């Protein structure tokens, strides 16, 4: 049946995307009820946003939804975000919540340009607080989300590209992930590591799909595992991660440290020209929950 890196259906987020233009600057905004969220830098090297906000009046902002202009009747700022009040509550607003995700967690990104959705892909918040996305100029304001039941949890809004070509942004409260700031400076991505917890979740998915050649009859202590894995640039695995893997461990009857012994053997010796879920490399962008959802057939 295969295992696929997949994204959550994006319709519910597509219905909230609008084009926000302030002068020469056009980008995307997220329209929920009667508020439009967009990156603070639409009101434009080290600018005092707070100040440039004065020169601005509601009629300065042009918010477009489909072939219709949304009249702005209020403006404010919350951290690095802009909150525009419009005179029309979005009829497509889905049930939603704003969430701040932690390193290693994944989400779907709806790439947009001119308030119009262009594509959706799956990605992960990297250990160094960036995301390896795919954005072109004009994508600022695009958002990342997860879907739980029928509630849309927005966890990311796109702000900029770092010199190595990776991306940085904020939660929907306007607070950046990582020490990044929306301004020009010489900020760069810190060294990145492999998300061990996610590699382990993926090996469980393989076993669940019948790809179990790499299993062995040994085990290891947590520390011995970390001592080998860090040498390959893997994030240290903690007791809390081990706990997050409990449901998968129980479903397969394979203890986490027993899976860690298989992983350790995979790192030191390799795959011997073999494959796991058709892959020649250990995938690190599927979380324990992504595995449960895809292996089970969760719908929305």
Give CA 177 to chain center in angstroms. Answer: 11
140 in catalytic set: yes
Interface with a second copy includes 58 (CB under 8 A)? no
Using the minimum distance from each CB to a second copy, give the nearer residue, 76 or 275. 275
Q: Which residues contact 144 (CB under 8 A, 6 or more apart)?
A: 107, 108, 109, 110, 123, 131, 154, 155, 156, 157, 158, 169
CA terminus-to-terminus distance, the chain: 21
The residue from 16, 22, 38, 41 that is catalytic is: 41
Asked whether position 271 contacts a second copy by CB under 8 A, the answer is no
Who's near 57: CB < 8 A, 6+ residues apart? none
* 6 belongs to the binding site for a second copy (CB under 8 A): yes
Exposure b/e, 179-206, CB count within 10 A at least 16 = b: ebebeeeeeebeebbbbbbbbbbbbbbb
Q: Which of 11, 23, 74, 190 binds a second copy (CB under 8 A)?
A: 11
Answer whether 259's CB lies under 8 Å from 237's CB. no
In terms of CB distance, is 103 or 138 closer to a second copy?
Answer: 138
- Alpha carbons 284 and 144: distance in angstroms, whole number: 18
Q: Which of 45, 54, 186, 281 binds a second copy (CB under 8 A)?
A: 281
Closest approach, Cβ 270 to a second copy, in A, equals 10
Are 57 and 39 contacting, i.e. CB atoms less than 8 angstroms apart? Answer: no
- Does residue 298 touch a second copy according to CB under 8 A? yes
Task: For the CB of residue 231, give the shortest distance to a second copy in the complex, in Å.
Answer: 16
278 contacts a second copy (rule: CB under 8 A): yes
Q: Are 291 and 205 in contact (CB under 8 A)?
A: yes
Q: Which of residues 145-164 bind a second copy (CB under 8 A)?
A: 161
Q: Is 247 in the site for a second copy (CB under 8 A)?
A: no
Which spans of this chain sit near a second copy (rule: CB under 8 A)?
Answer: 1-12, 14-15, 110-114, 116-121, 123, 132-136, 138-139, 161, 165-167, 209-210, 278-281, 293-294, 296-300
Query: What is the set of active-site residues?
Result: 41, 140
């Amino acid at each position: 049946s295969g295992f696929r890196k997949m994204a959550f259906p994006s319709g519910k987020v597509e219905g909230c995307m609008v084009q926000v233009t302030c002068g020469t600057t056009t980008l995307n905004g997220l329209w929920l009820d009667d508020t439009v969220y967009c990156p603070r830098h639409v009101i434009c090297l080290n600018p005092n946003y707070e100040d440039l906000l004065i020169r601005k009046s509601n009629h300065s902002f042009l918010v477009q939804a489909g072939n219709v202009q949304l009249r702005v009747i209020g403006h404010s700022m919350q951290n690095c975000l802009l909150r525009l009040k419009v005179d029309t509550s979005n009829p497509k607003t889905p049930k939603y919540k704003f969430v701040r995700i932690q390193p290693g967690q994944t989400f779907s990104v709806l790439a947009c340009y001119n308030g119009s959705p262009s594509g959706v892909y799956q990605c992960a918040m990297r250990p160094n607080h960036t995301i390896k996305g795919s954005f072109l100029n004009g994508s600022c304001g695009s958002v990342g989300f997860n879907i739980d039941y029928d509630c849309v949890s927005f966890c990311y809004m796109h702000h900029m590209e770092l010199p190595t070509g990776v991306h940085a942004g904020t939660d929907l409260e306007g607070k950046f992930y990582g020490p990044f700031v929306d301004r020009q400076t010489a900020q760069a991505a810190g060294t990145d590591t492999t998300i061990t917890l996610n590699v382990l979740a993926w090996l469980y998915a393989a076993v669940i799909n019948g790809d179990r050649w790499f299993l062995n009859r040994f085990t290891t202590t947590l520390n011995d595992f970390n001592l080998v894995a860090m040498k390959y640039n893997y994030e240290p695995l903690t007791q809390d991660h081990v706990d997050i893997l409990g449901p998968l461990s129980a479903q397969t009857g394979i203890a986490v440290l027993d899976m860690c012994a298989a992983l350790k053997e995979l790192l030191q010796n390799g795959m011997n020209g073999r494959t796991i879920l058709g892959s020649t490399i250990l995938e690190d962008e599927f979380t324990p929950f992504d595995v449960v959802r895809q292996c089970s057939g969760v719908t929305f």
